[PDB]
């Protein structure tokens, strides 16, 4: 179920996949959860997204050492906001290779983030250019278009039923698309549907600010985004 580890929560989603969850006070909103992923690929571990802070991110690495006890080969982060990239220095201190959309790395300094070490670029159809994501194993990285942010990316996990929408996708009962201050309101719906179409077999949709849901998270998110146009 949920495993509490210090101030974080970890939940196994599949034999080789766990969700990490960390919390930060957003004055006016309460203590806000953010989710990312941990994937074992044979003898190594892959991380999707940091926690909000360096200290929390170091705790993710402590949990991995305790529960998996294999090296973390790389991390990929899914846009330049604090919940996704706030712990980059902890990853770098640990010697982990880090990857982000080129645009996320460009935006990182102005957003108050540390850039990843490596930049992903994307084909016109949204799929990552494979040479920019070497040794990603089962992580299949897709740029669905601008939506929650200009730079948001998404990740499928081959060999599982899981696709990770990050902060682009909200759950099937979500009331709003949330803060749209960095959003692309025109392109959001199409970007949500493009995520679904990229990972058509994924039955478990993981996202930053809701628990895992069915594909109704994608349809519901797109349908709410239809009203922004």
179 counts as binding ligand MCO under rule CB under 6 A: yes
26 near 13, Cβ under 8 Å? no
174 counts as binding ligand MCO under rule CB under 6 A: no
With tokens 């102005």, the residue in question is 110
Q: What is the CA radius of gyration of the chain?
A: 16
135 near 74, Cβ under 8 Å? yes
Pick the closer one to ligand MCO by CB: 82 or 214.
82
The binder of 32, among ligand MCO, Zn ion, none, by C-beta within 5 to 8 A per type, is ligand MCO
Pick the closer one to Zn ion by CB: 91 or 167.
167
Pick the closer one to ligand MCO by CB: 83 or 151.
83
108 counts as binding Zn ion under rule CB under 5 A: no
* 167 annotated to bind ligand: yes
Q: How many residues does the chain have?
A: 229
167 counts as binding ligand MCO under rule CB under 6 A: yes
The CB-side HSE value for 163 (13 A sphere, CA atoms) comes to 27
Pick the closer one to Zn ion by CB: 81 or 170.
81
Q: What is the 3-state secondary structure (H, E, C) of 178-191?
A: CCCCCCCCCCHHHH
Give the separation between CA 29 and CA 123, rounded to whole angstroms: 37
208 counts as binding Zn ion under rule CB under 5 A: yes
CB of 13 to ligand MCO, least distance (A): 21
Q: Binding ligand MCO by CB under 6 A: which of 5, 12, 14, 32?
A: 32
12 counts as binding ligand MCO under rule CB under 6 A: no
The CB-side HSE value for 171 (13 A sphere, CA atoms) comes to 11
Number of neighbouring beta carbons within 10 Å of residue 133: 20
Which residues of this chain interact with ligand MCO, rule CB under 6 A? 29, 32, 81-83, 167, 178-179, 209
Residue ranges of the annotated binding site for Zn(2+) are: 79, 81, 83, 148, 167, 209
């Amino acid at each position: 179920g949920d495993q509490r580890f210090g101030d974080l929560v970890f939940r196994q989603l599949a034999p080789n996949v766990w969700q990490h969850t960390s919390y930060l006070d957003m004055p006016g909103f309460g203590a806000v959860a953010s989710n990312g992923l941990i994937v074992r690929d044979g003898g190594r571990v892959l991380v999707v997204d940091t926690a909000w802070t360096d200290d929390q991110t170091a705790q993710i690495l402590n949990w991995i050492k305790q529960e998996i006890n294999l090296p973390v080969a790389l991390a990929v982060v899914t846009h330049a906001h604090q919940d996704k990239m706030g712990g980059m220095d902890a990853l770098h201190a640990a010697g982990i290779a880090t990857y982000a959309n080129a645009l996320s790395n460009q935006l990182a300094p102005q957003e108050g983030m540390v850039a990843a070490q490596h930049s992903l670029t994307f084909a016109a159809n949204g799929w990552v250019e494979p040479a920019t994501a070497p040794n990603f194993g089962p992580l299949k990285v897709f740029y669905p278009g601008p939506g929650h942010t200009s730079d948001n990316i998404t990740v499928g996990i081959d060999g599982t039923d899981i696709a990770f929408g990050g902060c682009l996708i909200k759950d099937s009962k979500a009331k709003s698309l949330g803060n749209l201050g960095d959003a692309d309101t025109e392109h959001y719906a199409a970007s949500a549907r493009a995520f679904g179409a990229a990972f058509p077999k994924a039955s478990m949709i993981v996202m930053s600010h809701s628990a895992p849901d069915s594909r109704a998270a994608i349809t519901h998110t797109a349908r709410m985004a239809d009203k922004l146009r």
